[PDB]
Amino acid sequence: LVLYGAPYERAVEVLEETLRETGARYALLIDRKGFVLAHKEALWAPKPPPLDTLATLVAGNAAATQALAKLLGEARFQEEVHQGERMGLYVDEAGEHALLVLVFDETAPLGKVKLHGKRASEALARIAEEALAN
Amino acid sequence: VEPSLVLYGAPYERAVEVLEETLRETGARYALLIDRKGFVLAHKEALWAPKPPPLDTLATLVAGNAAATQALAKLLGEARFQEEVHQGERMGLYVDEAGEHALLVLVFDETAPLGKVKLHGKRASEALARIAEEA
Amino acid sequence: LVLYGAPYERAVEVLEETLRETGARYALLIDRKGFVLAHKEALWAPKPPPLDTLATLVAGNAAATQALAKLLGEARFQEEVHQGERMGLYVDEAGEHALLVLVFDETAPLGKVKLHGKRASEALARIAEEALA
Amino acid sequence: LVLYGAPYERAVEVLEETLRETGARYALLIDRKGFVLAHKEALWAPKPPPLDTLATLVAGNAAATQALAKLLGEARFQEEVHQGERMGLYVDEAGEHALLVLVFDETAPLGKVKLHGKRASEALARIAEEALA
Ligand SMILES: [Mg+2]
């Protein structure tokens, strides 16, 4: 899938809104292979690390954690949170073929990241679905 | 190859007590302390829970994951991720660093409130970090 | 860590010579988070796949294989070779913070890739440590 | 797949012979899921690391390197060699559903490890096929 035109504009709007609601630094919608479909960064945040690099590693992780998921009786993990000392990463499925990625620091309440991140992933899943079908 | 740590005597008992208490406080199914190499140092299961999946395999996979996510961590300016949560439709996994050479692992289902898992899971990892060192 | 001026030139020169002596297609010096410090491609070789993506994947692999390394009594693997039907990949540690990557096909003698690759990594390791000093 | 009866005995013989020919420490036939189908250790070698753990990590690696393989135009890497300061790991596809694993040290010439490792992988592939059939 490749987002362009109206669907792309709609996806970017959701990402922009998600950053405002969550307090996150960077938001991306990527396919499960690591291709960046859309991305937005908070004006207040510093330049992000290379986004294509981030996307590729997130996709790699999505494939890698399936062994753990299957051992627990799940096909795969739909939501994952990775927290460091200063930076955090939130990844949630945006439909069966895409992933919403949020990179955040201490100023983004985790509860808000998850609440609005989950809602954004559903909105993006719908946009991706329609872009794919007609 | 040997673990970065092995529990016996008092240290083991203190660790097991933390694991048992954590299961009660969180509602989780299984609790383990493993070294970053994948060896299980101590493990406890909730009395109500069914037989767990192979714990050695679980520990190995968690250890493999801990190594693998370091590329992402470095990209974000971190040495590594200290806390990680993986959520499926029903089953979830909570992993937190217990000192520099061990990891606390909690496997839970829908009957374990996530807020409780993280709250008591964090307390457990710190307690185990202290035990691991003195051990 | 980023290479500039002379240090960068010396790095590129080493990569160029390594391609010549090994017959490999692409040579890169990357860090553990997938950043490309320097790269060179053989003139005869086709356009390479996205180099930043290649570096990213190699970095991801470098992190992941440490679990296996430790089980075998090693902190990590210093040298790795991945071989497909036609394409191959050689990765060698260039110090503690960099990796030398050589992508090759059937026209590159593996013996030479490993022999000169190892030596090139040592040279690049010095250029790097001297670039941050 | 689960090896038993004659097929299992034949597989074990291949592993034992491979150890004799290579001087490797441990030899294993595992499925791509990480399950150990058969394994043998050199009598002169020290206790091996937990083999089930090793297999699980080798299988994980096999899945992880496919992205790199595909970027280079390969479906996956058929052969891989990881070398540390002293210990080495050789993994080769034994058919479409299994992997031959050899753990060796500086005393086992890599050339012979690869030659007999490849021979063994082909033999084990045929045995696994029959067993399943
Ligand atoms: Mg020379």
Which chain D residues are within 8 Å of C87, Cβ to Cβ? 72-74
Q: What is the DSSP string of C43-94?
A: TTSPPPS-HHHHHHHHHHHHHHTHHHHHHTT-SS-SEEEEE-SS-EEEEEE-
| DSSP state for residue B30 in the 8-state scheme | E
Q: Which residue of A has its CA nearest to B73?
A: A84
Q: Name every residue whose Cβ is closer than 8 Å to that of residue C6 and which is 6 or more positions away in sequence.
A: none
| Cα–Cα distance, C101 to C104 (Å, whole number) | 10
B113 touches chain C (CB under 8 A): no
**CA separation, residue B117 to residues A53, B16, B51, B126 (Å):** 32, 17, 20, 14
Candidates A82, A33, A27, A85; CA nearest to A57 is: A33
C63 touches chain B (CB under 8 A): yes
Candidates D81, C115, B76, C13; CA nearest to A53 is: B76
| Segment holding C37, helix H or strand E | strand C36-41
| Segment holding C102, helix H or strand E | strand C98-104
Phi and psi at residue D129, to the nearest 5°: -65, -50
| Segment holding C26, helix H or strand E | strand C26-31
CA–centroid distance, residue C78 to ligand 1 (Å): 19
Contact, A104 vs A23, CB < 8 A?
yes
CA–centroid distance, residue C116 to ligand 1 (Å): 6
Q: Name every residue whose Cβ is closer than 8 Å to that of residue A82 and which is 6 or more positions away in sequence.
A: A88, A89, B69, B72, B73, B81, B83, B84
User: Could you identify the residue written with the tokens 């630094």?
Assistant: A25
Contact, D132 vs D9, CB < 8 A?
no
| Cα–Cα distance, D62 to D52 (Å, whole number) | 15
B85: left (phi over 0), alpha (psi -120 to 50) or beta: beta
| Cα–Cα distance, A117 to A112 (Å, whole number) | 8
Contact, C83 vs D77, CB < 8 A?
yes
| Cα–Cα distance, C67 to D59 (Å, whole number) | 12
* Residue A111 CB-density burial (10 A; 0-12 exposed, 13-18 middle, 19+ buried): exposed
What CATH number does residue A110 fall under?
3.30.450.30
**CA separation, residue C12 to residues B84, C101, D62 (Å):** 39, 13, 32
Residue C103: strand, helix, or coil:
strand
* Residue B86 CB-density burial (10 A; 0-12 exposed, 13-18 middle, 19+ buried): buried
Nearest-Cα distance to chain D for C44, in Å, is 17
Structure token digits, residue D113: 């490890």
Which chain A residues are within 8 Å of D68, Cβ to Cβ? none
Nearest-Cα distance to chain A for D67, in Å, is 8
The dihedral of CA D14, D16, D19, D22: what is its sign? negative
Resolution (A): 1.5
Which chain B residues are within 8 Å of C60, Cβ to Cβ? 68, 71
Contact, C108 vs C26, CB < 8 A?
no
Residue A89: strand, helix, or coil:
strand
∠ Cα C95 C98 C104 (to 5°): 110
The dihedral of CA A115, A116, A119, A122: what is its sign? negative
Which chain C residues are within 8 Å of B60, Cβ to Cβ? 67
Structure token digits, residue C11: 């790095």
Q: Which chains touch D (3 or more CB pairs under 8 A)?
A: A, B, C
CA–centroid distance, residue C115 to ligand 1 (Å): 9
Candidates C107, A58, C82, C59; CA nearest to D69 is: C82
CA A24, chain centre distance (Å): 11
Angle between helices D51-64 and B55-68 (to 10 degrees): 40
Nearest-Cα distance to chain C for A59, in Å, is 11
Candidates D83, D65, D82; CA nearest to D74 is: D65
Contact, A90 vs A113, CB < 8 A?
yes
The dihedral of CA B5, B6, B8, B13: what is its sign? positive
Residue B4: strand, helix, or coil:
coil
Q: Which residue of B has its CA nearest to D33?
A: B57
**CA separation, residue A13 to residues A10, A27, A35 (Å):** 5, 11, 19
Candidates C31, A76, A5, D44; CA nearest to B75 is: C31
Which chain B residues are within 8 Å of A86, Cβ to Cβ? 77-78
Phi and psi at residue A92, to the nearest 5°: -140, 145
| Cα–Cα distance, A113 to A19 (Å, whole number) | 9
Sheet containing B92-97, strands listed edge to edge, beginning at the edge strand earlier in sequence: A36-41, A26-31, A98-104, A88-93, A79-83, B83-87, B92-97, B102-108, B30-35, B40-45
C5 touches chain B (CB under 8 A): no
Q: Which chains touch C (3 or more CB pairs under 8 A)?
A: A, B, D
Determine how many CB atoms are found less than 10 A away from the CB of residue C1: 11
Q: Which domain covers residue B93, as residue numbers?
A: 1-135
Q: Which chains touch A (3 or more CB pairs under 8 A)?
A: B, C, D
Do the Cβ atoms of B64 and D56 come within 8 Å?
Answer: yes
**Beta-strand runs (E) in B1-135:** 30-35, 40-45, 83-87, 92-97, 102-108
Residue of A77, A78, A82 best to disrupt the B interface, most CBs of B under 10 A: A82
Candidates D95, D91, D101; CA nearest to D130 is: D95
Structure token digits, residue C6: 């002379």
Q: What is the DSSP string of D52-106?
A: HHHHHHHHHHHHHTHHHHHHTT-SS-SEEEEE-SS-EEEEEE-SSSEEEEEEE-T
Contact, A8 vs A38, CB < 8 A?
yes
Structure token digits, residue B64: 């493999």
Contact, A40 vs A22, CB < 8 A?
no
Do the Cβ atoms of C53 and A52 come within 8 Å?
Answer: yes
| Cα–Cα distance, C101 to C97 (Å, whole number) | 13
CA D38, chain centre distance (Å): 10
Domains of chain A: total: 1
Nearest-Cα distance to chain D for B60, in Å, is 6
| Segment holding A1, helix H or strand E | none
